[PDB]
Amino acid sequence: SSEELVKQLMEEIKTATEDRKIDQEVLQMRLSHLEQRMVEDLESLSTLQSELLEKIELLDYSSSIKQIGENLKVLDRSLKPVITTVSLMVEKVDLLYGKA
């Protein structure tokens, strides 16, 4: 019963090492689940992030707005000569109208 206490105990360590074997199964099951959920979800986020990027570059109107701006400055330029050419016609027409 000292030699039967060693008997029982060698069965406990056999028992406990079987338990530990399953305990380590469950652990791998939770680890893998986290790793797989991390790529499903940290990945999913990256898609949308990049889908947003697409639309940000599809709503770049810097070129259209630079151009509108520049076309408006051409008109505003041609105002100078226009007023000049009109003012010379006014006196010309004023002269014919006084000497008709």
The structure tokens 């992030």 sit at 49
CB of residue 72 vs its own copies: minimum separation in angstroms?
5
For the chain, the residues before each gap (C–N > 2.5 Å) are: none
Residues 10-39 that bind its own copies (CB under 8 A): 10, 12-17, 19-21, 23-24, 26-28, 30-35, 37-39
Please give the angle made by the CA atoms of 65, 69 and 72, to the nearest 5 degrees: 140
Query: What is the C-alpha separation between 93 and 86, in angstroms, rounded?
Result: 10
Residues in the interface with its own copies (CB under 8 A) total: 84
CB of residue 46 vs its own copies: minimum separation in angstroms?
6
CA within 13 Å, CB half, 3: 0
CB of residue 79 vs its own copies: minimum separation in angstroms?
4
Residues 47-86 that bind its own copies (CB under 8 A): 48-53, 55-62, 64-69, 71-76, 78-83, 85-86
CB of residue 22 vs its own copies: minimum separation in angstroms?
9
